[PDB]
Design a protein around this ligand. Structure first.
Ligand SMILES: Nc1ncnc2c1ncn2[C@@H]1O[C@H](COP(=O)(O)OP(=O)(O)OP(O)(O)=S)[C@@H](O)[C@H]1O
Ligand SMILES: Nc1ncnc2c1ncn2[C@@H]1O[C@H](COP(=O)(O)OP(=O)(O)OP(O)(O)=S)[C@@H](O)[C@H]1O
Ligand SMILES: Nc1ncnc2c1ncn2[C@@H]1O[C@H](COP(=O)(O)OP(=O)(O)O)[C@@H](O)[C@H]1O
Ligand SMILES: Nc1ncnc2c1ncn2[C@@H]1O[C@H](COP(=O)(O)OP(=O)(O)O)[C@@H](O)[C@H]1O
Ligand SMILES: [Mg+2]
Ligand SMILES: [Mg+2]
Lengths: 348, 174, 328, 339, 643
């Protein structure tokens, strides 16, 4: 229990930002027939805590207890797949993107069991059970078609909550029937407010300069800000205005990878950069995150006309990375094309 | 499954080289009084890509249908898109002649051949085509991209016309 | 217990629909002999195809039997075409006895409302053709589709084709005001104009958006901001900021603008749509419009494939910046 | 089981006072009546009559005359007094998994004849719908009982058949008919039915059917009852196909005026005629090779149009893809014209 | 009936678009006349070898090389020399205590080598010494309890002990779980009652036929006792129950889990559970002692197979065995069986290699393991084939066949061994002349970048034979990956495509071979000019070296370019960290590791650095001070560094 979940708000009245949206979601809940929700926004914005607040407003306090169960579903290709699940008496939470192209093997089946439970469990509180869908943006085309037919079939049976970061990959049929809840990232002052409130509730005091530095370093990620504040608490018992905020280890590793890319353009350096990217990939860092970090740390050393070409190359190879399966090929292909272009730029 | 492979010894078989299929074809021919020519042998070997059962079945079918083994008889009884037509189309694409290459492609399309066997025969002819290594690599890459597009579901003459053109612009552009 | 307004506020019967004259005439001539042929309704979405034929089925069949003898199916099933084939097969296999108390014997056929008919492959349409000719007399089909030209030859040659021309903005605003006054929600008429501008002629999306705004605001005034957040439309000042950053020619402010749009939660597909709508209706040169619109098409394709919104948007904005700075 | 009373009832089924089954009006009865694929039916007679009938693999586009052809061969080879006892016609319509292979086919193939001694035959329709392991069982059944029974696999696409099943059988492709030979039949049916068609409507019928007799009869019959006369506009409006005038005007807009006016006009025409971008791309591609373009212009247009057609398949915004289609012509042909 | 069909369109008068005519511009009116005249193929006859690799000349005498191998029995001296050679190859291996046991085992044949060299004594198990120590000790307490029961019975006429009545052994396939329990049972005189998936085991069946084995004595206590009666229904020896492959549950095995739980509650004799599914230990409820067989060390199993071949008068190198075990992912049984097949066929090839660290060595087992000897002539080496340029059609077909045989496994051969086969120096990790050297380096880098762009093209824009991430997500993932195989007898009934795999593999193989040929030819052309730069005095050969790992240099060829042990450790510590009770309820997975894990490692590293400076002891009370129930070895793992 770190500071990120010990002080997570439990009801819609305890939220500190997006208060108008919180009141709108409360009015949504009080109508009694709230629709499928499509909650989206950047990572660390506060989508999950708002969904939890909605769930605590819908049902009683009993949603606050959770339990983990494992479900083994037989694929139509006759190869059983077992997935984990967080659940309660009133709601289910699932992430079928873990099932690969067999995500529909979750989608057409799992919620069906919940629908079965909706004719098995009777509570006389509400006529539905909320199914939370995490990382619905990572589903495939046929998985989303299965989800569409599923919410058509069990509309009056269960309600759907779809949490994502980007609604670009989701189909327009899946958006045409869900109420869209856009949760933007909190501002700097809002992160400072949350950090000061969380430090006061713990009994410590942090200066406004340190809170502003943490909020600026978090890149409008509230969870990253809370984790960095906890790390600063670990480093020093009192909070000083000049206390060094510690940096992320894989981020600084990516920074030295970019420095090694820039420094020398040789096949040997290309092989060490490939080894570094393999080391990052073995740490379960997503390759899209690696590409974004590499582009962010390579555009500092670039020149104005080179920046557009480098950004377009990074986008091209990241789309190739999405299409392919072995991401090291696309990562190092972007890397090697960048060293070739950078060398050609530096010779002239 | 993996424990079954663990409890055994896995031995690997590969496709038969056309030399071996030719030797067995001569063995069957010399024990069956089958009149033949060299072009019919090349056609039978082409229609059976590394398969000995397909080679024997095509030889028997051509002997039963016409009684002589030449190329026109083999391709009358097997009905692939003709490798002479596909070779001429690929040669036109090497010379960046979109008009004649599309003339051959549209003639093949109006003969009722599917996209799948047309692109398969295009790849099979292009595998042994006599051109430079870089041009062969670009041709194979574009043929593979188009074949993947056909396999995904979009299989029209527009896709094949766009390939011939991506093949023409490989040579017409540096 | 309750039902959303988009199906519960449909026309009950034929000729209650609006802005269709020939369609209603031939439909009424079909209802007069109680002989409804195979139907093919094509037009823009939300034009009122489904409401019209559901009204026709309510005219033809009794309301206790109208739900029993119609079956709404979707053609974008990912499990193949044999699933909907066996579904219509065992829907028409059952012959449950029904009658009307008004003094008219019911016609024996059933109705299959098969929507998104233009999303079917040619083989799937051929399987549907063989299913329709199998069930030639026991059930007469209808196909709701967006475009008539996607439906292959044997199906389109035998179903009567009806075009649903899109409703104008004024009739849509009148209908939306009717819904607002009848449902007791207080919303100003310029907000309703904003609703019909945002939905872009999709009356069904407009009704759904109005219901969502009513049940999300809480009986207070529906401002344009609530509608904008519900529909996912990016406000025009963000688009103007993107274009100003591209016209500046500096990459850092372009990155700042793209990051500001990304961390606000705004979708990249909506931004691509609004940039395209801005670009195709400006005083740009033809070559600039061509390059920008081609790049927008490839960026839309890459975003559908799951590529990162930040990288795709910064590549598109770099292309737009180069196009806007190569002439100045 | 079953699924056989419907066809038996359907064969002598017509209202006979009002209905006009034009497709069922002109059907061949034997191999001397189907005037098409003369090489194929001749070599089938040559195979049957000398007692060397092999395993057959009949494929091709549907409606080319495969099932009725093999019905004619089965009826001319076996009399009606012994037809049902030694000819077994199944298909993939009756599928409960793969049990049909180890059930009816394996039982039928492994036993001798009952009444009249001879060789038996299995007809298997839409054999491409079988699974891979069902074909792997069928090839073993064919291999070990090739002397007793022969097999005839009627499929639509040859690419869905495993290589060993294709290796056991000789293949017959039923291609589309040279559009020219179809015309005599169309003049025959218009002379019989007393209808008014111009030569342009004839051209429309032979370019829409792509060498299919049944679809030609369907379209001609439907346009006849719809209008009473058939010209290209009348058939194309009843069919709901992109008219040649509409595609020519679309091409003229994309070649002549600017981006915005052409885009607005094409959007108006698409909403007006119910036209999709896929069929626009198909007809524009057909128009590209009949219009005198330079080779580089043609290559550029074909590459761009193929890219747009691929992009439409994954489910992108049709409006932006239409703008890219306009852009493909605006890149090359407009500045070629203005030079 | 036969109603008419009409196309009703709301065609209002006007709009300038409903009634349209062809345009009057001359560009779209002069339609080009279509011609169907194609060239005539009757006159053009097809020459031999035009579309294939057919040659008029044929090789005679080069093929059909019969071995006729008569392996002489090795003398004692050369046996001692080869034993010392394996001693040099494996300094940590104790060579002397294993050879006489295998000599006794070997001292016309009719059984497999897996049961010919079956370990009869538990110390002959290779690796997993903690697991076999725990199992041997546990069976010692159970035999002690059986002897105590016998002593109590003859005299008549347990939290502190914590002797749980069952263990669950889990591990990979073929590491030796069943061999370990059989060896321990033979050592301690147990009598194994094996219940496997090859026999009908329904719940009432196994209950009513095997409870009395646990609850009662054995009627025959002396004589022929240490046997293995496999249950089915179509010194004193203590009974033992073994449940082989418990994760395999069928519909006919009705209530098998309830039956084995009833066995668990009411037994008086030891019970072993053997499985290879890691999820079962989390799925099964009950108290059992967990025993995990980790994957054994590659050098130890390599020396064990070297012992096996040395006993059979065969001399081999450890590198070929390391390649074989890397390809077989350290499966001991699969390696032993393939070694038996390959040795009893007459070995690979007769080659001489002088090693002191003598009969001719027998390298080449991994080459014929993948069937590459079926493509190549027996005078052709694989890397010698890859290094030289390729011009003639027949060895082009050989290259294509090599790559497509390696492509059915979805394995990238030329990428995994790119350094060792490119014409560039490879080393294991421990002015106008400058313009010319930089130009050569840029040429090499451009060729490499073009090749690997082409390979990204192949990986993304071409069809793959096996559908990747079919049941899980892509590689290096922590959330799942435990996709067990099917357990049901009904068929798949799928609509997969077979043409788009057979053609796809050939297409990918051809494109990969062509791209590698282009890159290698360009690099060789660039290195042709290295003599001019060496004459100029500047040497960029160092800038041209390839720095590969030591473990990648131990193989003839690698199956992958990564470190699998590293990745398995990282995913394992991720599951270990996020299996903690407070962190089980974190919703997401991507941002969960991305944000939670590095600050956890940062807090661990700060705690370790604070404890390295001799501060107060209360500083070690941060993690459990806020109730982070996380195991300590994972905390020490996070506190080390970030690689
Ligand atoms: N070449 C042709 N000329 C005239 N009529 C034809 C021709 N081909 C087919 N037909 C008609 O099509 C009817 C049915 O033929 P079939 O053999 O069933 O067609 P098919 O090729 O097997 O394709 P199917 O059955 O639709 S999957 C015949 O009775 C004829 O009326
Ligand atoms: N560590 C080992 N030492 C010696 N021989 C071994 C070893 N591991 C496997 N073997 C040999 O390989 C054979 C098969 O081993 P098993 O114990 O059956 O494999 P396993 O651990 O049970 O995995 P399964 O049963 O395939 S899931 C044994 O009988 C031995 O001959
Ligand atoms: N109103 C708030 N007050 C205090 N803390 C908050 C508030 N909203 C969010 N947080 C904190 O920020 C983090 C947001 O994480 P999460 O809910 O998972 O959002 P996302 O799903 O977008 O990452 C939570 O750990 C929570 O503790
Ligand atoms: N012409 C019309 N007359 C009356 N109501 C209409 C008309 N067109 C649309 N609507 C209303 O708009 C909604 C459109 O729903 P639907 O019929 O599904 O549209 P479509 O079938 O065009 O997709 C319905 O709720 C209906 O009440
Ligand atoms: Mg047929
Ligand atoms: Mg075992």
């Amino acid at each position: 229990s770190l500071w990120v979940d010990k002080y997570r708000p439990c009801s819609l009245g305890r939220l500190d930002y997006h208060k108008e949206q919180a009141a709108q979601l409360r009015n949504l809940v009080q109508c009694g027939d709230f629709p499928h929700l499509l909650v989206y926004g950047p990572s660390g914005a506060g989508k999950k805590t708002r969904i939890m607040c909605i769930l605590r407003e819908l049902y009683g306090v009993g949603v606050e207890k959770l339990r983990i169960e494992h479900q083994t579903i037989t694929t139509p290709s006759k190869k059983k797949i077992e997935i984990s699940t967080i659940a309660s008496n009133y709601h289910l939470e699932v992430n079928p993107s873990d099932a690969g192209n067999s995500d529909r093997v979750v989608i057409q089946e799992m919620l069906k069991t919940v629908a079965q439970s909706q004719q098995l469990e009777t509570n006389s509180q509400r006529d539905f059970k909320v199914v939370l869908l995490t990382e619905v943006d990572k589903l495939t085309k046929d998985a989303q078609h299965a989800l569409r037919r599923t919410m058509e079939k069990y509309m009056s049976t269960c309600r759907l909550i779809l949490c994502c970061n980007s609604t670009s990959k989701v189909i327009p049929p899946i958006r045409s029937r869900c109420l869209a809840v856009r949760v933007p990232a909190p501002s700097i002052e809002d992160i400072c407010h949350v950090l000061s409130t969380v430090c006061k509730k713990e009994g410590l005091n942090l200066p406004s300069q340190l809170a502003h530095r943490l909020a600026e370093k978090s890149c409008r990620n509230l969870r990253k800000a809370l984790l960095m504040c906890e790390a600063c608490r670990v480093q020093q018992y009192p909070f000083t205005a000049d206390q060094e905020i510690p940096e992320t280890d894989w981020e600084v590793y990516l920074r030295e990878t970019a420095n090694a890319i820039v420094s020398q353009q040789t096949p040997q350096r290309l092989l060490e950069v490939r080894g570094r990217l393999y080391e990052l990939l073995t740490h379960c860092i997503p390759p899209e995150i690696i590409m974004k970090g590499l582009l962010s740390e390579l555009l500092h050393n670039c020149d104005g006309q080179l920046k557009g070409e480098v950004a377009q190359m990074a986008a091209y190879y990241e789309h190739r990375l999405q299409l392919g399966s072995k991401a090291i090929y696309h990562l190092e292909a972007f890397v090697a094309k960048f060293m070739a272009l950078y060398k050609k730029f530096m010779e002239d | 499954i993996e424990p079954i492979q663990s409890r055994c010894a896995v031995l690997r078989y590969t496709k038969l080289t056309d030399a071996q299929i030719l030797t067995r074809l001569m063995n069957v021919i010399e024990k069956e009084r089958v009149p033949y020519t060299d072009d019919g042998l090349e056609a039978i070997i082409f229609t059976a890509q590394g398969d000995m059962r397909q080679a024997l079945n095509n030889l028997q079918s051509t002997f039963s249908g016409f009684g002589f083994i030449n190329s026109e008889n083999v391709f009358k009884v097997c009905d692939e898109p003709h490798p002479l037509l596909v070779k001429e189309m690929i040669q036109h694409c090497v010379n960046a002649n979109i008009d004649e290459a599309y003339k051959i492609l549209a003639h093949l399309w109006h003969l009722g051949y599917s996209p799948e066997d047309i692109i398969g025969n295009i790849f099979r002819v292009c595998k042994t085509f006599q051109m430079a290594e870089y041009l062969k690599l670009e041709f194979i890459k574009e043929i593979g991209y188009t074949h993947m597009k056909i396999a995904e579901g979009v299989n029209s003459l527009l896709q094949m016309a766009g390939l011939l053109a991506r093949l023409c612009q490989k040579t017409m552009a540096p | 217990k309750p039902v959303p307004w988009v199906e519960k506020y449909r026309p009950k019967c034929v000729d209650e629909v609006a802005f269709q004259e020939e369609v209603v005439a031939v439909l009424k001539k079909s209802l007069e002999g109680a002989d409804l042929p195979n139907l093919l309704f094509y037009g823009p979405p939300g034009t009122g195809k489904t409401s019209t034929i559901l009204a026709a089925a309510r005219e033809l069949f009794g309301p206790e039997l109208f739900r029993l003898r119609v079956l709404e199916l979707n053609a974008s099933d990912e499990r193949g075409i044999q699933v909907v084939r066996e579904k219509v097969k065992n829907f028409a296999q059952l012959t449950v006895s029904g009658s009307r108390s008004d003094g008219k014997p019911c016609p024996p056929f059933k109705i299959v409302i098969l929507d998104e008919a233009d999303s079917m492959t040619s083989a799937a349409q051929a399987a549907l053709r063989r299913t329709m000719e199998k069930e030639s007399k026991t059930t007469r089909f209808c196909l709701i589709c967006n475009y008539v030209s996607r439906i292959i030859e044997p199906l389109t040659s035998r179903c009567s084709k009806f075009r649903f021309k899109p409703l104008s903005d004024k009739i849509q605003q009148q209908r939306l005001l009717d819904i607002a006054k009848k449902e007791n929600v207080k919303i100003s008429d310029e907000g309703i104009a904003y609703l019909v501008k945002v939905s872009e002629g999709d009356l069904r999306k407009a009704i759904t958006f109005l219901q969502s705004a009513t049940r999300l605001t809480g009986g207070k005034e529906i401002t344009e901001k609530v509608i904008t957040d519900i529909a996912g439309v990016i406000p025009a000042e963000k688009i103007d900021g993107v274009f100003a950053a591209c016209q500046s020619g500096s990459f850092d402010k372009l990155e700042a603008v793209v990051k500001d749009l990304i961390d606000e939660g705004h979708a990249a597909t909506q931004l691509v749509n609004q940039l395209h709508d801005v670009v195709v209706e400006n005083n740009l040169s033809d070559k600039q419009k061509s390059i920008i619109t081609e790049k927008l098409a490839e960026v839309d394709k890459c975003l559908a494939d799951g590529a990162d919104e930040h990288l795709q948007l910064i590549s598109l904005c770099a292309t737009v910046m180069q196009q806007l700075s190569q002439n100045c | 089981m079953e699924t056989s009373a419907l066809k038996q009832q359907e064969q002598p089924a017509a209202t006979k006072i009002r209905n006009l089954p034009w497709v069922e009006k002109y059907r061949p009865q034997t191999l001397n009546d189907l005037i098409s694929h003369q090489d194929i039916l001749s070599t089938i007679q040559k195979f049957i009559n000398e007692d060397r009938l092999p395993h057959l693999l009949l494929y091709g586009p549907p409606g080319t005359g495969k099932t009725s052809t093999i019905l004619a061969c089965a009826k001319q080879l076996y009399k009606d007094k012994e037809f049902g006892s030694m000819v077994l016609e199944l298909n993939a319509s009756d599928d409960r998994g793969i049990d049909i292979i180890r059930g009816p086919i394996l039982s039928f193939a492994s036993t001798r004849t009952i009444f009249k001694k001879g060789f038996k035959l299995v007809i298997l329709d839409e054999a491409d719908a079988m699974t891979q392991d069902a074909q792997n069982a069928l090839r073993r059944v064919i291999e070990k009982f090739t002397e007793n029974t022969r097999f005839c696999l009627i499929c639509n696409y040859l690419s869905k058949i495993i290589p060993a099943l294709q290796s056991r059988c000789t293949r017959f492709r039923f291609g589309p008919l040279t559009p020219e030979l179809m015309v005599p039949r169309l003049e025959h049916v218009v002379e019989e039915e007393k209808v008014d068609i111009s030569e342009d409507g004839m051209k429309a019928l032979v370019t829409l059917s792509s060498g299919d007799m049944r679809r030609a009869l369907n379209i001609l019959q439907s346009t006849n009852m719809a209008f009473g006369k058939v010209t290209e506009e009348t058939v194309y409006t009843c069919t709901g196909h992109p008219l040649k005038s509409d595609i020519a005007n679309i091409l003229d807009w994309m070649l002549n005026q600017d981006f915005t006016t052409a885009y607005r006009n094409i959007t108006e025409l698409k909403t007006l005629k119910g036209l999709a971008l896929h069929d626009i791309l198909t007809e524009i591609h057909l128009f590209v090779h009949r219009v005198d373009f330079p080779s580089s212009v043609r290559i550029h247009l074909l590459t761009k149009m193929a890219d747009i057609e691929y992009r439409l398949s994954v489910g992108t915004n049709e409006k932006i893809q239409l703008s890219s289609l306009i852009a493909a012509f605006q890149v090359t042909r407009d500045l070629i014209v203005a030079e | 009936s036969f109603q008419r069909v009409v196309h009703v369109q709301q065609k209002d008068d006007g709009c300038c678009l409903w009634h349209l005519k062809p345009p009057s511009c001359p560009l779209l009116t002069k339609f080009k006349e279509l011609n169907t005249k194609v060239i005539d193929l009757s006159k053009c006859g097809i020459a031999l070898g035009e579309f294939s690799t057919l040659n008029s000349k044929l090789k005679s005498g080069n093929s059909a090389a019969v071995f006729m191998r008569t392996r002489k029995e090795f003398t004692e001296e050369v046996r001692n020399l080869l034993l010392e050679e394996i001693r040099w190859s494996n300094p940590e291996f104790s060579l002397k205590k294993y050879f006489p046991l295998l000599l006794k085992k070997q001292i016309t044949e009719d059984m497999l080598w897996t049961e010919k060299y079956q370990p009869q004594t538990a110390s002959e198990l290779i690796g997993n010494e903690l697991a076999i120590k725990k199992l041997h000790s546990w069976l010692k307490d159970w035999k002690r309890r059986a002897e105590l029961e016998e002593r109590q019975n003859l005299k008549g006429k347990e939290e502190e002990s914590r002797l749980c009545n069952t263990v669950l052994i889990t591990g990979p396939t073929g590491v030796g779980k069943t061999a370990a329990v059989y060896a321990c049972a033979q050592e301690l005189g147990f009598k194994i009652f094996e219940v496997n998936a090859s026999s009908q085991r329904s719940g009432r069946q196994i209950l009513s036929q095997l409870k009395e084995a646990t609850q009662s004595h054995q009627v025959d206590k002396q004589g022929v006792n240490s046997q293995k009666p496999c249950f089915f229904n179509s010194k004193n020896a203590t009974s033992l129950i073994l449940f082989e492959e418990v994760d395999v549950i069928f519909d006919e095995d009705a209530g098998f889990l309830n039956a084995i739980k009833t066995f668990m509650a009411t037994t008086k004799r030891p019970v072993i559970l053997t499985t290879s599914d890691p999820t079962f230990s989390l799925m099964f409820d009950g108290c059992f002692e967990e025993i995990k067989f980790s994957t054994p060390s590659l050098l130890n199993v390599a020396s064990y197979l070297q012992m096996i071949c040395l006993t059979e008068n065969f001399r081999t190198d450890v590198k070929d065995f390391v390649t074989l075990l890397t390809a077989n992912t350290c499966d001991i049984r699969k390696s032993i069986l393939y070694l038996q097949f390959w040795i009893r066929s007459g070995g690979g090839v007769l080659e001489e290699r002088p090693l002191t660290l003598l009969p001719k060595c027998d390298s080449g087992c991994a080459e014929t393991l993948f069937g590459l000897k079926n493509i190549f002539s027996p005078s052709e080496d694989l890397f010698s084939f890859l290094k030289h340029k390729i011009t003639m059609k027949e060895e082009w077909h050989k290259f294509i066949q090599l790559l497509t045989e390696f492509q059915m496994r979805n394995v990238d051969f030329l990428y995994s061994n790119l350094e060792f086969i490119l014409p560039l120096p490879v080393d294991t990790i421990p002015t106008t002349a400058g313009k010319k050297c930089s130009a050569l380096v840029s040429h090499c880098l451009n060729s490499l970048s073009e090749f690997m762009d082409n390979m990204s093209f192949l990986d993304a824009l071409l069809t793959d034979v096996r559908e990747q991430n079919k049941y899980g997500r892509n590689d290096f993932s922590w959330t799942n990956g435990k996709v067990t195989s099917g357990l049901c007898d009904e068929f798949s009934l799928e609509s997969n495509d077979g043409w788009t795999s057979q053609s796809s593999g050939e297409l990918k193989a051809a494109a990969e071979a062509l791209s590698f040929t282009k890159c290698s030819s360009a690099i060789s052309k660039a290195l042709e000019t290295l003599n001019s730069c060496k004459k100029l005095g500047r040497d960029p050969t160092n800038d041209l070296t390839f720095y590969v790992s030591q473990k990648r240099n131990n193989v003839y060829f690698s199956q992958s370019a990564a470190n699998l042990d590293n990745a398995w450790k990282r995913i394992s510590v991720i599951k270990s960290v996020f299996s903690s009770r407070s962190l089980l309820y974190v919703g997401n997975r991507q941002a969960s590791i991305i944000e939670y894990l590095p600050t956890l490692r940062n807090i661990c590293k700060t705690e370790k650095l604070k404890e390295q400076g001799k501060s107060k002891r209360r500083f070690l009370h941060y993690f459990e001070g806020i109730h982070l129930d996380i195991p300590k070895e994972t905390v020490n793992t996070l506190a080390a560094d970030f690689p």
